[PDB]
Amino acid sequence: TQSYTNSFTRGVYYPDKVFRSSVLHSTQDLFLPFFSNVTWFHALPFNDGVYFASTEKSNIIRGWIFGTTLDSKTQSLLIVNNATNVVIKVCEFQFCNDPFLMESEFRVYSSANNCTFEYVSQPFLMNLREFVFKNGYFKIYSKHTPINLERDLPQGFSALEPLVDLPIGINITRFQTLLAAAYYVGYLQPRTFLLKYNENGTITDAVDCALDPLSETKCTLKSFTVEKGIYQTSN
Amino acid sequence: VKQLSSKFGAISSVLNDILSRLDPPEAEVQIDRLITGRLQSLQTYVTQQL
Amino acid sequence: VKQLSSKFGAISSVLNDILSRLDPPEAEVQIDRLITGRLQSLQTYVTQQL
């Protein structure tokens, strides 16, 4: 099925790898907007990058697959979240209409061709798990913050720390989720933010400079509070 | 207003006659001259207004 | 203080980057651009201070 819901000013990651003190640094990168019509699912386009968020009790849904046309066109991506490690396979794969992935199966589409990458490291999980896939390399962000909510996506701010930096140069147009689940997919857009760092150096607050005139005059002068008056913001 | 029709060492005075006729990375040495001249004119105007 | 991070059309905003990968035949143009920009910032600061 498919349903519509609203974000709660979340989906903000770290742009660079530079330590900053309690300063108000304004960046400009492909960010998810604060209040957007996100889609809940129970051949998605990639656009500028997706925001994957899925809550699961005992890690049922796992895996990803990326590609343009599959078969023999611009290779494919295969992320498998095994219980001991994470296997990344970048080869040419055919078919793969449905995943339908001892008791379970250990095959999706097979038909391997050559080899480009094999990145085996520590596993991601071990709910409210968020993943940002931004493509020219391949950035993967993650954050595991347990919460107590019925439909998830709660109030507050959670900054997503970078985990995986794959140096793969390829275009991706179609996005599909490998393997009764529940996940959300948002779309990234070029926006300008104003990230706030604390004393520990983690992002605790941000504003969007394209939503509201109050949220636009919060960006011209680097201050979260606004005194009473009239301010000239744009033209 | 009248300072917008000066040359400041460039080959023209309007941006569209350089961005559509001259090369993209050889017009950077004349767009910079126009920017420097107009910035100097605006700065001198603000200076006398103060 | 914030004007030291500007490039003014050069390759870098810090002199140590310019004086570590450019040959002394070709390391003076960016230095002159940064010198002109920082000099103009200095006279602007002195004029508004007066």
Place this chain on the structure above:
Amino acid sequence: FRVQPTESIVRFPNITNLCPFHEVFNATTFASVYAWNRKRISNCVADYSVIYNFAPFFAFKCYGVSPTKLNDLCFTNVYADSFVIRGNEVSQIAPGQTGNIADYNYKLPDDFTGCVIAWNSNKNYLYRLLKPFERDISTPLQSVVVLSFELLPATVCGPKKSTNLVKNKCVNFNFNGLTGTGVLTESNKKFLPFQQFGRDIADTTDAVRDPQTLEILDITPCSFGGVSVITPGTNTSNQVAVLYQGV
């Protein structure tokens, strides 16, 4: 008044496996203009100071980097192309020249492309009649090595000898690409393991990770100030007093 440094140290990582570049041009044959190669190895130590003469490298036209200063630079992104072109017209391969190649084959977006070497070869290219770095493979017909860099963490460094770590004095350092002077102090922790540099409101480097022991090292240059001379008058006396300011 200022304090002059008395030592220079280089803090490079312990990896010393050389990149396969001495036999990169000797491996196989350079390709055509139909396809360029861009996937290269950037997990090694580069060495661009091995061969200069009696090698197939004629043109040394470099943009933004000089060939002399190549053993004290750490590189972030390294590419290496290999393709054939007519040696009679090699001037069009430049960030700024628009001709036959800069219509549907190549476009360098005025970036630090390292050095472009065309050389000579006598021993096809299958050119077709464009965005920068946008290859096209489509089927009118008729029968160089560029190291595009990005000096703005680093894993490909130059050949240099790493020395010991010295603190609490004015010493020149070289961790990755910083050639300034300062005093190293172990304080102001809570660096996360993905992040290396440190900055502030004024965007100045106040911290740096050691590539060997992964320890936080603060950067503060030496104390300075002004010198004022208090004179009672030349006609009156001859001796003066010197006031140092802010020290």
